[PDB]
Design a protein around this motif. Structure first.
Motif, PDB file in Angstrom:
ATOM      1  N   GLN G 109       0.831  -1.193   0.000  1.00 38.76           N
ATOM      2  CA  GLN G 109       0.000   0.000   0.000  1.00 38.76           C
ATOM      3  C   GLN G 109       0.872   1.252   0.000  1.00 38.76           C
ATOM      4  OE1 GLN G 109      -1.378   2.110   3.267  1.00 38.76           O
ATOM      5  NE2 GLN G 109      -1.379   0.369   4.675  1.00 38.76           N
ATOM      6  N   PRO G 110       0.373   2.367  -0.537  1.00 39.02           N
ATOM      7  CA  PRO G 110       1.247   3.518  -0.792  1.00 39.02           C
ATOM      8  C   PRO G 110       1.819   4.124   0.481  1.00 39.02           C
ATOM      9  CG  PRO G 110      -0.783   3.688  -2.047  1.00 39.02           C
ATOM     10  CD  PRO G 110      -0.983   2.587  -1.062  1.00 39.02           C
ATOM     11  N   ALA G 112       4.234   7.844   1.658  1.00 42.02           N
ATOM     12  CA  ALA G 112       4.654   9.162   1.194  1.00 42.02           C
ATOM     13  C   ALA G 112       5.222   9.946   2.370  1.00 42.02           C
ATOM     14  CB  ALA G 112       3.488   9.901   0.532  1.00 42.02           C
ATOM     15  N   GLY G 113       5.918  11.041   2.061  1.00 37.08           N
ATOM     16  CA  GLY G 113       6.412  11.940   3.081  1.00 37.08           C
ATOM     17  C   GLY G 113       5.928  13.353   2.821  1.00 37.08           C
ATOM     18  N   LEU G 114       5.605  14.048   3.909  1.00 37.60           N
ATOM     19  CA  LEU G 114       4.940  15.340   3.842  1.00 37.60           C
ATOM     20  C   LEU G 114       5.627  16.343   4.757  1.00 37.60           C
ATOM     21  CD1 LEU G 114       1.134  14.449   3.795  1.00 37.60           C
ATOM     22  CD2 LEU G 114       2.740  14.679   1.900  1.00 37.60           C
ATOM     23  N   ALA G 115       5.463  17.625   4.432  1.00 44.39           N
ATOM     24  CA  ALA G 115       5.994  18.714   5.240  1.00 44.39           C
ATOM     25  C   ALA G 115       5.279  20.002   4.859  1.00 44.39           C
ATOM     26  CB  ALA G 115       7.506  18.867   5.050  1.00 44.39           C
ATOM     27  N   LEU G 128      -3.395  11.645  -0.802  1.00 45.52           N
ATOM     28  CA  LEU G 128      -2.840  10.308  -0.607  1.00 45.52           C
ATOM     29  C   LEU G 128      -3.941   9.272  -0.410  1.00 45.52           C
ATOM     30  CD1 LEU G 128       0.037   8.908  -0.170  1.00 45.52           C
ATOM     31  CD2 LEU G 128      -0.660   8.902   2.221  1.00 45.52           C
TER      32      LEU G 128
ATOM     33  N   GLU K 110       5.878  18.099  10.028  1.00 40.45           N
ATOM     34  CA  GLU K 110       6.316  17.331   8.864  1.00 40.45           C
ATOM     35  C   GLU K 110       6.020  15.864   9.158  1.00 40.45           C
ATOM     36  OE1 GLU K 110      10.480  18.332   8.492  1.00 40.45           O
ATOM     37  OE2 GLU K 110      10.018  20.358   7.781  1.00 40.45           O
ATOM     38  N   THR K 111       4.838  15.402   8.756  1.00 38.47           N
ATOM     39  CA  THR K 111       4.471  14.009   8.971  1.00 38.47           C
ATOM     40  C   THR K 111       5.387  13.105   8.161  1.00 38.47           C
ATOM     41  OG1 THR K 111       2.876  13.865   7.161  1.00 38.47           O
ATOM     42  CG2 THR K 111       2.102  14.772   9.252  1.00 38.47           C
ATOM     43  N   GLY K 112       6.290  12.420   8.853  1.00 40.71           N
ATOM     44  CA  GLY K 112       7.311  11.629   8.205  1.00 40.71           C
ATOM     45  C   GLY K 112       6.738  10.516   7.348  1.00 40.71           C
ATOM     46  N   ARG K 113       7.635   9.877   6.607  1.00 35.56           N
ATOM     47  CA  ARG K 113       7.231   8.813   5.704  1.00 35.56           C
ATOM     48  C   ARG K 113       6.587   7.668   6.477  1.00 35.56           C
ATOM     49  NH1 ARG K 113       8.557   4.321   5.511  1.00 35.56           N
ATOM     50  NH2 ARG K 113       7.691   4.272   3.393  1.00 35.56           N
ATOM     51  N   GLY K 114       5.494   7.161   5.926  1.00 36.48           N
ATOM     52  CA  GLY K 114       4.780   6.063   6.548  1.00 36.48           C
ATOM     53  C   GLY K 114       3.646   5.628   5.653  1.00 36.48           C
ATOM     54  N   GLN K 115       2.968   4.571   6.084  1.00 39.43           N
ATOM     55  CA  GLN K 115       1.844   4.060   5.324  1.00 39.43           C
ATOM     56  C   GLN K 115       0.693   5.064   5.346  1.00 39.43           C
ATOM     57  OE1 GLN K 115       1.976   0.344   7.232  1.00 39.43           O
ATOM     58  NE2 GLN K 115       2.156  -0.886   5.363  1.00 39.43           N
ATOM     59  N   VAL K 116      -0.301   4.815   4.494  1.00 40.86           N
ATOM     60  CA  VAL K 116      -1.434   5.728   4.388  1.00 40.86           C
ATOM     61  C   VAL K 116      -2.199   5.794   5.705  1.00 40.86           C
ATOM     62  CG1 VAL K 116      -3.608   6.146   3.205  1.00 40.86           C
ATOM     63  CG2 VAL K 116      -1.606   5.428   1.904  1.00 40.86           C
ATOM     64  N   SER K 117      -2.342   4.657   6.389  1.00 39.56           N
ATOM     65  CA  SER K 117      -3.054   4.640   7.664  1.00 39.56           C
ATOM     66  C   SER K 117      -2.346   5.498   8.707  1.00 39.56           C
ATOM     67  CB  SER K 117      -3.192   3.202   8.158  1.00 39.56           C
ATOM     68  OG  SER K 117      -3.699   2.363   7.137  1.00 39.56           O
ATOM     69  N   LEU K 119      -0.344   8.065   8.166  1.00 36.80           N
ATOM     70  CA  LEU K 119      -0.490   9.474   7.825  1.00 36.80           C
ATOM     71  C   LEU K 119      -1.901   9.968   8.107  1.00 36.80           C
ATOM     72  CD1 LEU K 119       1.744   9.708   4.664  1.00 36.80           C
ATOM     73  CD2 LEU K 119       2.184  10.520   6.974  1.00 36.80           C
ATOM     74  N   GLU K 120      -2.908   9.114   7.918  1.00 37.93           N
ATOM     75  CA  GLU K 120      -4.269   9.497   8.282  1.00 37.93           C
ATOM     76  C   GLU K 120      -4.380   9.776   9.775  1.00 37.93           C
ATOM     77  OE1 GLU K 120      -7.138   6.538   7.324  1.00 37.93           O
ATOM     78  OE2 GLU K 120      -8.866   7.773   7.861  1.00 37.93           O
ATOM     79  N   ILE K 121      -3.826   8.882  10.597  1.00 39.73           N
ATOM     80  CA  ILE K 121      -3.884   9.068  12.045  1.00 39.73           C
ATOM     81  C   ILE K 121      -3.150  10.341  12.452  1.00 39.73           C
ATOM     82  CG2 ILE K 121      -3.133   8.105  14.239  1.00 39.73           C
ATOM     83  CD1 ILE K 121      -3.636   5.315  12.961  1.00 39.73           C
ATOM     84  N   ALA K 123      -2.527  13.007  10.608  1.00 41.15           N
ATOM     85  CA  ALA K 123      -3.238  14.186  10.129  1.00 41.15           C
ATOM     86  C   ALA K 123      -4.422  14.523  11.025  1.00 41.15           C
ATOM     87  CB  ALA K 123      -3.698  13.972   8.690  1.00 41.15           C
ATOM     88  N   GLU K 125      -4.569  13.794  14.169  1.00 48.40           N
ATOM     89  CA  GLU K 125      -3.890  14.342  15.340  1.00 48.40           C
ATOM     90  C   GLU K 125      -3.558  15.816  15.159  1.00 48.40           C
ATOM     91  OE1 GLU K 125      -3.069  14.996  18.657  1.00 48.40           O
ATOM     92  OE2 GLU K 125      -3.615  12.900  18.332  1.00 48.40           O
ATOM     93  N   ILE K 126      -3.040  16.179  13.989  1.00 47.40           N
ATOM     94  CA  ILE K 126      -2.657  17.562  13.724  1.00 47.40           C
ATOM     95  C   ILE K 126      -3.877  18.472  13.747  1.00 47.40           C
ATOM     96  CG2 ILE K 126      -2.121  19.016  11.741  1.00 47.40           C
ATOM     97  CD1 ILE K 126       0.350  17.650  11.331  1.00 47.40           C
ATOM     98  N   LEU K 127      -4.968  18.042  13.110  1.00 49.38           N
ATOM     99  CA  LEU K 127      -6.172  18.865  13.093  1.00 49.38           C
ATOM    100  C   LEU K 127      -6.713  19.069  14.503  1.00 49.38           C
ATOM    101  CD1 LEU K 127      -5.915  18.877  10.131  1.00 49.38           C
ATOM    102  CD2 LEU K 127      -8.138  17.762   9.899  1.00 49.38           C
TER     103      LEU K 127
END
Lengths: 176, 182, 182, 182, 182, 182, 182, 176, 176, 176, 176
Positions: G109-110, G112-115, G128, K110-117, K119-121, K123, K125-127
């Motif tokens: 599954q995909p 990505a890295g964000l900032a 994403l 800067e949400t570091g590299r990781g799976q989509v799940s 990054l969803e969690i 994000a 958290e950030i909101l």
């Protein structure tokens, strides 16, 4: 620190390369010990591979300016700049341990980055420096100036007895 | 691809370019080109100089090669011609040294870096003084000025315009149109 | 691969590209190309400029070569023409300087980095002042404006649109379609 | 590009260039070129030397190859011929060693870097002394001087002018124009 | 450019050059060249060795390939033939191994670097012992000396002159002139 | 320069070289070469292996390609055939696997490095165990030994001589002279 | 280079290779090759996949181009077809998707890295999620499995053997010899 | 600091590679302890892989110079230069722990880049110094000079009982 | 620093990897504690992943020389060099916390670049060292040498109760 | 500095990532405070993003072994390793500030390169560590084994009231 | 240093970027000042460009939990996190120097590299974090929720008088 306790006994250690900081420390210690009773002697132990000439000259001048006698004990090794300081002690009070090595050789440098005029000036300075160092070393020994010319052209390494015979060291101590 | 073809055609036209600092590589290349173009004893060679100078020995090799071949060498000063480049520009055959109207020329004394014992430094300093004296002698010979004036002027950096260089004797003429080119 | 080929075809079509910062390398290549194309003395030469500028000596050599050959030079400004690139763009033959509608022209004053003793720095600063004065004089000659206005305007960075550049005098016309070039 | 082309066109005329420090690669190339040119055993080979020195084994290989082939080898010194390059220059066939008027020739003694146990260091020091003695013998053989004087002079560097080198015996003649080369 | 051309022109004459440290790449290249030259079944192959040694496995591959093909291989030492290069030089067909008068040969025992657990280190140390024994046996077979003499002599580094190597048994003759080789 | 020409002339004779660590690039190259040589379905293909091994997937792709084409593949071990390279050497057509007398074969169990959470590490560890089992089974199939013997023997590193490898079953014959291959 | 030549001949027959991580450069080269081979609208195209995956947009471009041209595209998996390479392998025309017997396939599954600020992170996270949903939908379309099963399986890494891949619907058949593909 | 506290009980440590600074510290400590009453022994513990050789010689003749006995205790390992100092203690007062290891081998050096004359001089000095170290080790052991030459050419590693038999130590202590 | 205060309470910490400096510090603390009254126990807490094998044996020999007993408490993680030191405490006084883990495995090294003879000598020494560690661990446990050899080939991780059953630990403490 | 002053007030600060040095310091302070009267509580403030898992276990076991109660308050954030220590306080004495946040998730590791056997052993120990950590967390909370195993599958972030409801803490303190 | 002397004067400094170490130090100082007489105010001077969120929230929760009043004085600059702490002082006791500048803006990460799940969690958290900071800022200011949301979309810079009018501070002090 044992260095302070040895300072109380009027012994000074020179066990690193001769630099500006080490020369500053050594001549500060010499002036300090001059500030106390001017009838007690000073003991300097040298194990150095040599270093800068100007710091060497500062230490040498402080040694001859300070009134009480300074006795030098060769130890471990005494390379070019260390040899000059080792032989600079008061006559009859220069000593070496049985297994110490003594080395003498000509000055080295890098009169480099510069135009032609700057390199000419620096080269004349270097030749004068070499002549002055050799004259200084010849006065502190019995050998003439020409012998020193011939002897520091390349590296010459002397043992304790050879140093005694040459004149760099007055006497070689095995035990107290 | 591009960047070598045009140079090849220019060499076919008896045009040599010297547009980077003078080192062993480029001195060897220029000597090779001069030797190759010497195959025809009767045609002139044009050399274009835009360089800030470089190593002394490489410039000596180029100068000797230019003085060696039978063909006359026409030197064109374009852009910058400083230190060794100025000496090479002034080394062309008499009456055939030129500069562009906005060409800029610098005269500069040698410099070097040494390391080692006192004897080696003494030897190398003597050699450097000899090299400087030789360069002063060659410049005085080529520009027609006295030795004293040249050795006094080269102590610092002196900068020359095209007309000032022509008056000094470093170059022979300054043109504006291809009519005056030999 | 591709770039060398397309540039070769364009050169065969008498098109020269200047699309990188101006340094000795690019200045030797452009001067070589101009000299090569000067073989036929009746056809014009087109030079496209998209560059942020570079060294003074290299650009001045390019300017001298452009003023040297008998062929007329047409300069097209595309993208960015800043600092020395603007000076080269304005150095084309009168009536044949153009720019694209969304082109950008910037006027800049020289900058340099100096080091050494207080006697060498004096000489280099005087030379830098001389270079700035010469650049201002040449720009004033090529634009039709007075020297005082050019000196006042180039103290800081001034940006020009295509129509503003045409009104100022740096270019002769602003083109849109294929009927523009002669 | 250009360099390879001009060097090939020069090698077509039996001319070899040695213009970089002598390492294994350049020695291999020079040996290959000499072996290739040895196909015709009646034409001479010209070697142009502008080098600061290099390795010992590589230079020994070049020297042995030069003494190997039946063709006479003419050595020409341009620019700098120092350290082992001087040895190669002096190794040409008698009567065919030349130097340009402004060339520098330097005589040097070997230097090396050693690391290991005391026995290995002893062995390598003995080998270095043997190499130094071999070079002294070969230089004395090729220049005609006695082995004692060469030892004394090689001790610390000695720089030589063209006429000084000719008097010493390193070269045979000093050329000015093209009439002198065979 | 030059080197590839001269090497191809020499390979056309059946001459192989081994002038770099022996690794996988160069061993692969020499194996390929020997395999190609094996197409002609009765013409000899000449190998020129100027190398400081290299990896064990690559050298063993070269040795096996040389012993494989039907054509005789003539090994020639120029410059340096040290460590495994000496073994390759001594591996030529009997009666066809020569060296130049200033050639210089070194005999060296293997060295390696290991890391891991005690068992892996034990296994690798056993393999290194086996490799050293195999090299001693092969050198004894090729040079005609006893195994004990080779084992005792190769513990340290021993250097050989051309005549010393000939007397030892590494080579069979020393060249001075091209007339002395087939 | 040389290497491409030698390899092309060898591939013209249906010779493929594998002389570097097995990664994606040279596995892709070897697959392409095998597919190209598959055009003629009657002639055999010879593969020469001198490699220390490499990646698992690339070597597996090479193995599948060798088992894919209709042409028989003959494998020759020269120098070193270790880790995955040993697997490819024993994957040739039965009766057509050979090694040179001084070649060394090494059997080695897989290794890998993982990172991430506990679940990902669990999945990757299971996959690594699966790959190890597959390699053991394939080696047992191509060698003739039982799976248990291979599993016990591959725990540590085992080195093999040519004769030991032949007795074990990895190769079919030991190569001595040119009369061996058909 | 040899690899360039063999790739040229293979592309000449009909073969396209994809043997490295999917980036912009290789996606551009794959699209160019597909567009060129689309000149003849009748013959099929073969694509060989050995890659660990790469950027999402480049693979999307490759997938769109494969689904665009009229020629049928046959996909072959050799070695590793992981991450988006699996998606490309499953994207071939129905009935023409194969893999080698030891071909290993991974579903991922995909990532990505964000900032940036909290407002940009929201947009990029939504994008994403949209990309992940699109990939799940496309995989469900191409393999015939339900969307929920694909999502649940791709939540964490799953590894597939060739037969397991065929059962899952990623491929259509497993080849063993040369007679299995058109 | 426990090191100062152990200094009050005349205990010195050599637990690092032998260098100029460590050697200077060790001699300063020895001289300070000698400046106290000369009728108490000094205990020195050695756990070192060796190091610089002139500094080692300085420590050696410092120990040989002072009046009170110096008792050396091997610990963990005492290799090369550390072995020389371990065997340099006063006779009858050299001890090792049961699981310590001792190694002896010839000096190692790197004669740096220089002319042929410089390398000749340096190599001559190195050969002289190897001979001196071998003779020094022969005097402190029961073994002759030739045997010490033979056994030092490569690396030889001895255990506690092997060292006792060879002569590098006098006894192996298991408990106080 | 709380470390000095725990020193007054006869508590020594081993929380870093075993190196030369750490081992020197640890045995200095042990000697200082032994220097005072020898009728008091010493408590050592070990939370270490292992380290050098000579410093290991230095600490081990120091522990077996002093008269005062050394109670060893496992801490968090005790692997390799930590496991042998944990098992080296006085019998009946080796303890482990309930959630601590113990690891045992064979020694690791890197025989550096050298000739064949040097690698032969180093490999022989490595084998001897591995056998010596095997025997040492066998004596401190109840298992024979062969069983320890079998379990040392690869990593073997034991919990508190498993360590109690095996013999590396005499008791597991949960509360005081 | 204020840290010592708070030490006299028997409060302990954990404001860095969990490591060997930090864990050693923290349990050294815990044993020191144990050395005083065992009838006084200890306050620990936890502001950590996690850390090593063996050092976590060392601190946890020291807290469970030391006799008097240990007070834990959440501090800004308490991530995976910090969450276990925060929930490890004595029942009825675990607190959090209103704006501190708690994170729970499964362990992460980097199984180093090695043979297949070593990877198998390390993975087995990793699974054992995961199961033991989940069991430990389940005992300190009202939630059973299955719920905890489900929830640490991915990151789950809880606020103060959410943490109180789940069982991580016992109360939320807004003022003294 | 003057920092301790100002500590005796109940003056606390925040003159660096907000981080874990600085937050722990500030919290230690605040708790220590609580240990003193609880009827004396605490003066905190803020010259900071912001920093990490969690340390910011830890300091804020300490100031809200600490019983005596915490008077805050903006000096130099107070941006992002520093603005939150400056406005978090007790009402009527928030001041700023005349030439100081205040900046408010939304959280950055800067949400570091990781799976989509993952990054969803993160994000979500950030909101949630951004909403919580908005609500806290709106509580301490007179402005409503919508206005504070609108203003922090981009960087808004306020001077002393503008800050007083907006509600971030309570008064501007020129001379005591």
């Amino acid at each position: 620190d044992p260095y302070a306790k040895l300072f109380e006994e009027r012994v000074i250690f020179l066990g690193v390369q001769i630099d500006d900081a080490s020369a500053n420390d050594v001549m500060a210690q010499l002036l300090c010990l001059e500030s106390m009773d001017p009838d007690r002697d000073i003991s300097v132990y040298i194990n150095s591979p040599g270093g800068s000439f100007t710091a060497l000259t500062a230490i040498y001048d402080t040694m001859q300016y300070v009134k009480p006698d300074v006795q030098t004990v060769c130890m471990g090794q005494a390379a070019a700049a260390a040899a000059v300081l080792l032989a600079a002690g008061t006559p009859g009070k220069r000593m070496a341990l049985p297994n110490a090595r003594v080395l003498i050789h000509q000055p080295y440098s890098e009169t480099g980055r510069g135009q032609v005029s700057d390199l000419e000036i620096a080269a004349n300075e270097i030749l004068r420096m070499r002549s002055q160092l050799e004259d200084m070393l010849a006065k502190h020994s019995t050998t003439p100036v020409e012998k020193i010319r011939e002897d520091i052209e390349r590296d010459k390494i002397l043992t304790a007895e050879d140093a005694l015979s040459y004149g760099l060291i007055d006497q070689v101590i095995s035990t107290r | 691809g591009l960047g070598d073809q045009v140079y090849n055609r220019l060499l076919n036209e008896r045009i040599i370019f010297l547009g980077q600092p003078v080192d062993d590589d480029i001195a060897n290349k220029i000597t090779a080109q001069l030797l190759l173009l010497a195959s025809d004893p009767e045609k002139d060679i044009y050399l274009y100089i835009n360089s800030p100078g470089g190593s002394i020995t490489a410039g000596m090799a180029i100068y000797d090669t230019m003085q060696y071949i039978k063909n006359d060498v026409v030197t064109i000063a374009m852009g910058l011609a400083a230190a060794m480049g100025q000496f090479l520009l002034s080394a062309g055959t008499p009456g055939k040294r030129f500069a562009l109207p906005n060409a800029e020329i610098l005269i500069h004394q040698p410099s070097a870096g040494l390391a080692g014992s006192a004897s080696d430094i003494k030897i190398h300093a003597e050699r450097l003084l000899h090299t400087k004296k030789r360069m002063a002698e060659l410049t005085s010979q080529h520009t027609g000025q006295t030795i004293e004036q040249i050795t006094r002027d080269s102590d610092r950096d002196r900068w020359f315009d095209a007309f000032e260089a022509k008056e000094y004797g470093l170059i022979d003429d300054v043109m504006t149109t291809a009519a005056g080119m030999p």
